[PDB]
Design a protein around this ligand. Sequence first.
Ligand SMILES: Nc1ncnc2c1ncn2[C@@H]1O[C@H](COP(=O)(O)OP(=O)(O)O)[C@@H](O)[C@H]1O
Ligand SMILES: [Mg+2]
Length: 772
Amino acid sequence: HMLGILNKRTLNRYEKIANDIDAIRGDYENLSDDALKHKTIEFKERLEKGATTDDLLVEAFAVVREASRRVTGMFPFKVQLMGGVALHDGNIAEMKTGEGKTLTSTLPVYLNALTGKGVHVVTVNEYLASRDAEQMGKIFEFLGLTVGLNLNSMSKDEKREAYAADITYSTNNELGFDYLRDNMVLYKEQMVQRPLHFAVIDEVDSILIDEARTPLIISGQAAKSTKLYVQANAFVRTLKAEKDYTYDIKTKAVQLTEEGMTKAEKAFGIDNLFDVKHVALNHHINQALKAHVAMQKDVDYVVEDGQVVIVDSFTGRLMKGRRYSEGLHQAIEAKEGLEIQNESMTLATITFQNYFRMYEKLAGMTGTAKTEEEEFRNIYNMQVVTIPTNRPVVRDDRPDLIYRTMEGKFKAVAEDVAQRYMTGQPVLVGTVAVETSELISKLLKNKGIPHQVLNAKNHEREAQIIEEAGQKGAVTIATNMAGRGTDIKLGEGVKELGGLAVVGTERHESRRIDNQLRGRSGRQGDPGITQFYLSMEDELMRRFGAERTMAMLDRFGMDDSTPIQSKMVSRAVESSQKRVEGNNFDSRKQLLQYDDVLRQQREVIYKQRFEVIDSENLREIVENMIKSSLERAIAAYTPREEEWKLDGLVDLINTTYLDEGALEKSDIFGKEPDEMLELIMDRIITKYNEKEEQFGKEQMREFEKVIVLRAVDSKWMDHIDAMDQLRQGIHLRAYAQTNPLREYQMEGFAMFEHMIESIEDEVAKFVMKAEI
Ligand SMILES: Nc1ncnc2c1ncn2[C@@H]1O[C@H](COP(=O)(O)OP(=O)(O)O)[C@@H](O)[C@H]1O
Ligand SMILES: [Mg+2]
């Protein structure tokens, strides 16, 4: 009291703001709905003036806090206020399961949605994206803000509409795919997305760590060409057994030698086969080579009804649907003289990781992120902020139990479930593979135990099931990816029984996953036990140290009859687990480097491309591309060092820029390249001014606008593909000791040069020649 007011801080940034917001809690306590709502208009004014989101934060969150209470009945605990603050800072709020992560997000979503730039709230699947949007939207609309739901089944129009709302719920995939499409548009107005302001990712460690490199692809409705496969195969019939190519015994590895390499360079009329401009050609020869030397007909595959069918080596049984990849199937189709069925071509591509970084602001939530903090900082520049639970966790996380054989471990799981089932306490068996869920289910049916099995198939159907897993008698086998996001509240008479008993069947590659399973119990403060069963036979127990240890236990005489539960053991296991998590981080880190090569290239091209679409006049640009294109032509024929500059370039110009027979005797001969370039450029300019004004002015700007886009997109496609072929075969271009990364960066840079020149020569011919 008085002794207190006189004393009045060792509180952190979040404990504070949470208290401030709690203080001004009555200044909205009795306000009126219309008045509470008008608060938005107010915040918007102040922001218009000069205030910042940080400024209004304390009040904004107070508004939402009251708003919720009225609209939902829930008054945002103080822990939750701290979470919102963390999110607003562009960081990761780590709130254990059950803490109210969803509601927690409405705080910073609202705040960052006032400037009118839109805010994306991302989820794992449309069910959750639709539920949240549906439930939380009721709060935002209350404070006069429009919530939009962006789904896969929506039309370019209806999408654009939701991407226009203040807030927009969606899923990682849709957001990604829309982005690729907005980047294939012909008219700036065909896009759906607004600049990527700020995204708030739920289940963020799953989206940015686990599914980070998930590829989002837009393939081509049309097909690829087949001419090269033929040429490549025809060529391979030329070569000989040893001085033309090598063939490894153990591995089916096949390589070309200097002779074949020269015979190839000779055969296809090219200086360098390793030249980045011929990556596709070199790749085709390696498959056509593989198809003739490492794939035997009637043993590796068969030819039936004009096709190539993969024979399962030992079972002699055909695998009717599948093909070989990286064009090896087309290589064999060519060899066997069959109809070459070509693959479709990728037109646009991007990973979740490289898509989310296009944003201006990012924030995420998950109950499990601390372990990956470092990665989050370096890649997404986000920090993990651990928000304290609303109530103290009283859940009894018993130490791992180890059996000798899987059968033993699984029998134990059933025994346990049974015992708990008899008392009537709920049980939720966590699993990692659906195959495993079924293993236990069969075991529970042999005991007469009624249960449910979730395999992340139908999310809504499963969500409902889960919601009833806290009820007395319930028994649920859920596969790691099932039920995510649905709170299991305890049924009447359940805490009195011990709360939810969680039973883990294996430790996952990442402790995070094990902790997510643990977290389903001990919700707000509810009682509950978690227990993991493992066997010496599990995948992890055969790893690093785990081996040595289990080796010793085996020699010690351990049986299924009696499990092991030692702090020395359980910690030696924990030691491996960390090591596994170590290397997995090292790999990710390495792959980040390769992924970046194409990433930076894509960001550049898209930017340049958007500029084209968002440009009214394009002639200066096209002219430049022609200049460059041309300078290259002349340089091709004017060796800066039997003959001193032969000439044919003439017909190369009359056939590529001017018209047939427009020049030859004109200023070309003995001259200097420096000269020939400007002379021929004028001819071109009048030739363009002519076509320009003479055949259609506005029609020229659009004649251009199209000819360029098609040029970019066309070459990008080729690039994405050659860039892939290069990566796949970069160990072939790198030397023994050398690290391929460098070689990939270098050639990857060299190919981009190639791709710009290719874009240039195309937009050069087409513009100066063809008519609309
Ligand atoms: N401030 C609150 N007051 C009362 N209940 C809340 C509050 N915040 C969240 N909840 C409840 O917590 C449960 C789980 O919420 P959820 O947002 O899904 O959190 P999480 O994602 O961590 O599990 C829901 O039943 C939700 O209604
Ligand atoms: Mg959630």
